[PDB]
Amino acid sequence: HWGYGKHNGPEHWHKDFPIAKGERQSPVDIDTHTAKYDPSLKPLSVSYDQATSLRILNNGHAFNVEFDDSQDKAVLKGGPLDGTYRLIQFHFHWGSLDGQGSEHTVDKKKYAAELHLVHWNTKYGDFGKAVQQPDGLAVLGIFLKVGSAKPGLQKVVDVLDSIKTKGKSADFTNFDPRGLLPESLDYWTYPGSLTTPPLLECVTWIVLKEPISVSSEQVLKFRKLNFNGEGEPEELMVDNWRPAQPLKNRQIKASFK
Numbered sequence: 001h002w003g004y005g006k007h008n009g010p011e012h013w014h015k016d017f018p019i020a021k022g023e024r025q026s027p028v029d030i031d032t033h034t035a036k037y038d039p040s041l042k043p044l045s046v047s048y049d050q051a052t053s054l055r056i057l058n059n060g061h062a063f064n065v066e067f068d069d070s071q072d073k074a075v076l077k078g079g080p081l082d083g084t085y086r087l088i089q090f091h092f093h094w095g096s097l098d099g100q101g102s103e104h105t106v107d108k109k110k111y112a113a114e115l116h117l118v119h120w121n122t123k124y125g126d127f128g129k130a131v132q133q134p135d136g137l138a139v140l141g142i143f144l145k146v147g148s149a150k151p152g153l154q155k156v157v158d159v160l161d162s163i164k165t166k167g168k169s170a171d172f173t174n175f176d177p178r179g180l181l182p183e184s185l186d187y188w189t190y191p192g193s194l195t196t197p198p199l200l201e202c203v204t205w206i207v208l209k210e211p212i213s214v215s216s217e218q219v220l221k222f223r224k225l226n227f228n229g230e231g232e233p234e235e236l237m238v239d240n241w242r243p244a245q246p247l248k249n250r251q252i253k254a255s256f257k
């Protein structure tokens with residue numbers, strides 16, 4: 001199966017997922033000087049007050065915190081979005097060292113990690129139908145830099161020892177994803193894709209400008225996870241990021257003047 005190593009990583013994915021070389025791939029470098037303020041963007045609304053987290057899963061690529069998306073409990077609206085997008089899961093991408101790990105870059109600068117809150121457009125009824133649509137998904141991306149600890153991340157950090165290997169899961173109820181946001185909702189937006197196989201071109205990306213700060217100890221615990229299953233030789237789960245892809249016929253728009 002696909003992964004992030006030399007023999008199954010991003011440079012190999014196109015052989016089984018030809019859209020990897022498509023017209024709308026993610027991530028991209030965000031050139032902050034070329035990005036243009038867009039007055040047509042509406043105010044962004046992140047409404048997570050009623051979110052219901054359920055479970056945390058090591059899927060052999062990253063870990064996903066899953067939400068009850070059987071109703072509009074936690075939604076993203078506004079900004080570039082037409083309609084309501086329901087939160088289904090979040091996960092991260094991170095590096096083996098603090099100088100890399102993010103998928104998007106900002107004027108080519110790589111952050112230590114990147115958080116993705118994944119939402120699907122409710123007009124399509126289920127995530128599976130949504131990923132057959134050009135506007136099926138919205139991913140809210142948040143950069144992580146290493147500095148002071150992020151208190152709202154610590155519950156995630158502390159459960160990782162129980163999901164060390166691929167296929168392990170644990171209860172993860174009553175987690176509030178609002179604690180993972182920065183203060184400002186200033187953002188850049190562009191049309192793109194999943195950054196993992198199957199690389200489907202369904203995503204409106206909304207990437208926040210303000211990083212969150214996490215401590216070195218927090219990110220070091222991400223790096224103790226394993227790509228491998230239980231019993232198998234240890235392969236540390238690090239560098240699970242795809243590099244920036246060609247911008248092609250796209251423009252990045254900014255929410256801020």
Ligand SMILES: Cc1c(F)c(F)c(S(N)(=O)=O)c(F)c1F
Binds near residue numbers: 014
């Ligand atoms: C043995 C092997 C590969 F060489 C490979 F390139 C990929 S791919 N294109 O998905 O990255 C695989 F899934 C795989 F199992």
Ligand SMILES: Cc1c(F)c(F)c(S(N)(=O)=O)c(F)c1F
Binds near residue numbers: 116118194203
């Ligand atoms: C199922 C799934 C992923 F595994 C994933 F990694 C992403 S990503 N990195 O583009 O945020 C998604 F949007 C997504 F829907």
Ligand SMILES: OC[C@H]1O[C@@H](O)[C@H](O)[C@@H](O)[C@@H]1O
Binds near residue numbers: 036251
């Ligand atoms: O033709 C002018 C238009 O060009 C487009 O590429 C830009 O996105 C618009 O902001 C601009 O008004």
Ligand SMILES: OC[C@H]1O[C@H](O)[C@H](O)[C@@H](O)[C@@H]1O
Binds near residue numbers: 155159173174176
């Ligand atoms: O909120 C996520 C999780 O945080 C801590 O692990 C709590 O002990 C647990 O009860 C909860 O599910």
Ligand SMILES: [Zn+2]
Binds near residue numbers: 092093195
């Ligand atoms: Zn992701």
